[PDB]
Design an enzyme around this catalytic site. Structure first.
Site, PDB file in Angstrom:
ATOM      1  N   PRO A 118       0.789  -1.209   0.000  1.00  0.00           N
ATOM      2  CA  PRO A 118       0.000   0.000   0.000  1.00  0.00           C
ATOM      3  C   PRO A 118       0.819   1.255   0.000  1.00  0.00           C
ATOM      4  CG  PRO A 118      -0.839  -1.478   1.518  1.00  0.00           C
ATOM      5  CD  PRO A 118       0.408  -2.066   1.115  1.00  0.00           C
ATOM      6  N   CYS A 119       0.453   2.149  -0.890  1.00  0.00           N
ATOM      7  CA  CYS A 119       1.042   3.454  -0.917  1.00  0.00           C
ATOM      8  C   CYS A 119      -0.067   4.456  -0.906  1.00  0.00           C
ATOM      9  CB  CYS A 119       1.854   3.607  -2.172  1.00  0.00           C
ATOM     10  SG  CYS A 119       3.366   2.794  -1.995  1.00  0.00           S
ATOM     11  N   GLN A 120      -0.123   5.272   0.124  1.00  0.00           N
ATOM     12  CA  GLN A 120      -1.204   6.211   0.227  1.00  0.00           C
ATOM     13  C   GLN A 120      -0.673   7.585   0.469  1.00  0.00           C
ATOM     14  OE1 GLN A 120      -4.237   3.404   2.194  1.00  0.00           O
ATOM     15  NE2 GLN A 120      -3.618   3.135   0.060  1.00  0.00           N
TER      16      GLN A 120
END
Ligand SMILES: Nc1ncnc2c1ncn2[C@@H]1O[C@H](CSCC[C@H](N)C(=O)O)[C@@H](O)[C@H]1O
Lengths: 693, 5
Positions: A320-322
């Protein structure tokens, strides 16, 4: 002292053959085999430093041509070498992964070519080719004798760094409910490779419950990736050493945990106790029973409950990259990794660095290629390259593979130099890709070019996917039910295939559970107000909240209260039309409480199912799309069962990598893995056997 | 000045 060609001219006929485009942009009067610049003679094949622009690094090239131009000027042609900085990796040469750095003396041979006046030549360079698979000692000897060396090629298309029944273990990081891994193994099966997800890591208990149900044999770990990494490290040492209320057996192991401080814990089953009574005790609390620890380590090591380096052939993941889009599109750009939690990107590459799998598949959103000028994208790629993996990057649009959506995602291949690098499978459906390609990675879109028209299957619509499912209501508590009847369409015929037909061997020989059952056909249960609202949305294409009572369109297509009608309220006394809807997109939005139509597609299936800001209402039924319907849109086989509260089930489906995408990738993986791949085209056309029946 | 492109 002025540059001059040397030796006799290449035979006119031969030059004509070798370099056709020069005879008949620059054109030649004749070609030579050599030139003298500043008292040094150069020859075709010599490797050379070439002068570039003011204050720019000298180019590095292989001389392929020496010719006099029709303008009576003296030219030479070079096939360029790329420094790691010169590739897409760019400024990310400076990163290191577990002590893996980019050798400043490593270059990559490209097929890019340029012409030049002879006087740009600076000097010769000793550049040698080192076979990645040659013996280690010789390799150091060679590298020792050179100025520069190359073991791979660079191609701008798909950022490709490349060299110049069988079983395989797979490890799924950030596995979710297992969209990507399930699909991968399925495609692979078709390739003739038996690829099985052996370990999966995910910190959402329900995602794990799903994966574990559909893949009983896989070791499904409900924990954080970084904890898994640590655990591995300690597992290594444990294997090297090999080690009233009574403790009968040790059933599990973990490192750290939610409440627990770091360090190993074992799961113990006690004598006379049913499962569900087993608990986690710390490592030293069990100094009492060192033999039982032995039973477990030796036993776990033989069943490979956890991977030691070399044990894992493939690693796939969607870290995940947020904060790389929307409100966060513009924040924290300088050290994106330190920042926020793009951190999983590091952890992912850390586990790859520790396990060294033959293949790496890394999935993610397109924004990693846009945010901070493609920083994260470059970082991933750079890591693989510094680790000496072959690698390529491509963007794939889900709908192109038989789904009623347009979900573009980034996929990053990695392959050891001892392995064949996988390709990207071309679209099988006639959906058309736009200019969605980040100019940073303009050449990584996997699509056919317009120049080539190939016959592809008709693009799927919403009806194509969900028209056969039985009516249900806002509240539908049964997670298992009967289909109303037979499937109506090719797609419906496909997603309703059993595990055997899908070549899904998770349950080995024999059918698994739930054969022919309709699973998770349940929508988010809207509260009474929301339900009351959708009940009031007309059933017709394009219907939305604007169709609700007391609202109208003012000048400029901006929604308004109709002065003629006072705000309407529901039984609860709350407004029929909520305020946010009136201000959403400056009052120009048609999305709030929007109804889908069979005609249409859902550009991106998302994790949330609320009708507040999206068109998610079923075409004919007074309800939001059910979980299973979202699942089908996402390409999940109908047999793939989801667990957890409804909202969590939606989250699972919404997070997933579209299965058909993963399956196509699976095929390519299978082929490369089996050495049944062909020469170096980035793209591969799936065969007739794949695609459908 | 070579011109790479
Ligand atoms: N810190 C973490 N440690 C382990 N898993 C994490 C994590 N943070 C997020 N995840 C897991 O990230 C997955 C990322 S979404 C993954 C979807 C999956 N690739 C599929 O195709 O089905 C979910 O399990 C998310 O909860």
């Amino acid at each position: 002292h002025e540059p001059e060609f040397i030796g006799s001219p290449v035979a006119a006929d031969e030059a004509r053959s070798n370099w056709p485009k020069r005879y008949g942009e620059l054109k030649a009067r004749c070609h030579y085999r050599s030139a003298k610049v500043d008292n040094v003679v150069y020859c075709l094949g010599d490797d050379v430093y070439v002068k570039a622009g003011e204050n720019e690094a000298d180019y590095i090239g292989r001389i392929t041509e020496f010719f006099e131009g029709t303008d009576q000027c003296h030219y030479f042609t070079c096939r360029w070498f790329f420094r790691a900085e010169d590739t897409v990796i760019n400024s990310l040469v400076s990163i290191s992964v577990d002590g893996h750095k980019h050798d400043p003396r490593r270059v990559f041979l490209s097929e890019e070519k340029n012409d030049n006046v002879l006087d740009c030549i600076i000097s010769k360079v000793k550049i040698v080719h080192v076979d990645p698979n040659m013996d280690p000692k010789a390799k150091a000897q060679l590298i020792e004798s050179c100025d520069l060396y190359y073991d791979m090629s660079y191609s701008v298309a798909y950022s490709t760094f490349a060299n110049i029944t069988r079983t395989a273990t797979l490890l799924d990081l950030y596995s979710g409910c297992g969209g990507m891994s399930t699909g991968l193994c399925l495609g692979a099966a078709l390739s003739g490779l038996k690829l099985e997800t052996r370990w999966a890591v995910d910190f959402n208990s329900f995602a794990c419950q799903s994966l574990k149900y559909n893949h009983p044999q896989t070791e499904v770990r409900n924990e954080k990736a970084d904890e898994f990494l640590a655990l591995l490290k300690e597992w290594a040492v444990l294997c090297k050493k090999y080690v009233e209320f009574v403790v009968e057996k040790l059933v599990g192991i973990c490192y750290g945990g939610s409440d627990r401080e770091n360090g190993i814990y074992f799961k113990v089953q006690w004598e006379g106790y049913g499962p569900e009574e087993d608990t986690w005790e710390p490592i030293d609390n069990l100094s009492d029973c060192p033999q039982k620890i032995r039973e477990f380590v030796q036993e776990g090591h033989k069943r490979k409950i956890l991977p030691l380096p070399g044990d894992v052939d493939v690693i796939c993941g969607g870290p995940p990259c947020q904060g790389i889009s929307g409100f966060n599109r513009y924040r924290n750009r300088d050290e994106p990794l330190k920042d926020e939690k793009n951190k999983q990107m590091v952890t992912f590459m850390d586990i790859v660095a520790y396990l060294k799998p033959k293949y790496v598949l890394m999935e993610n959103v397109v924004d990693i290629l846009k945010f901070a000028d493609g920083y994260l994208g470059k970082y991933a790629l750079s890591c693989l390259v510094a680790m000496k993996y072959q690698a390529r990057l491509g963007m794939m649009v889900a709908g192109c593979y038989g789904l009623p959506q347009f979900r573009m995602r980034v996929f990053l291949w990695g392959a050891l130099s001892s392995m064949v690098l996988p390709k990207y499978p071309l679209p099988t459906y006639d959906v058309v890709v736009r200019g969605g390609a980040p100019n940073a990675f303009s050449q990584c879109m996997v699509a056919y070019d317009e120049t080539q028209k190939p016959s592809l299957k008709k693009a799927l619509l919403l009806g194509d996917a969900i028209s056969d499912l039985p009516k249900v209501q806002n509240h539908q508590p049964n997670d298992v039910m009967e289909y109303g009847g037979s499937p109506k369409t090719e797609f419906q015929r496909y997603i309703r295939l059993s595990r055997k037909d899908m070549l899904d061997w998770s349950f080995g020989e024999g059918a698994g559970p739930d054969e022919g059952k309709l699973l998770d056909h349940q929508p988010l249960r809207l509260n009474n107000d929301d339900y009351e609202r959708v009940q009031q949305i007309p059933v017709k294409k394009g219907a939305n909240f604007r169709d609700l009572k007391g609202v109208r369109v003012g000048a400029n297509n901006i929604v308004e209260w109709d002065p003629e009608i006072e705000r309407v309220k529901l039984s609860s006394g709350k407004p029929l039309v909520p305020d946010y809807a009136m201000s959403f997109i400056k009052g120009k939005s048609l999305k709030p409480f929007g109804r889908l139509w069979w005609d249409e597609t859902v550009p991106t299936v998302v994790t949330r199912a609320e009708p507040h800001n999206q068109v998610i209402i079923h075409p004919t039924q007074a309800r939001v799309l059910t979980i299973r319907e979202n699942a089908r849109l996402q390409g999940f086989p109908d047999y793939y069962r989801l667990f957890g509260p409804i909202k969590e089930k939606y989250i699972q489906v919404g997070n997933a990598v579209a299965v058909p995408v993963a399956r196509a990738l699976g095929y390519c993986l299978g082929q490369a893995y089996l050495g049944e791949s062909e020469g170096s085209d980035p793209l591969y056309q799936l065969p007739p056997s794949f695609t459908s029946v | 000045t070579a011109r790479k492109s």
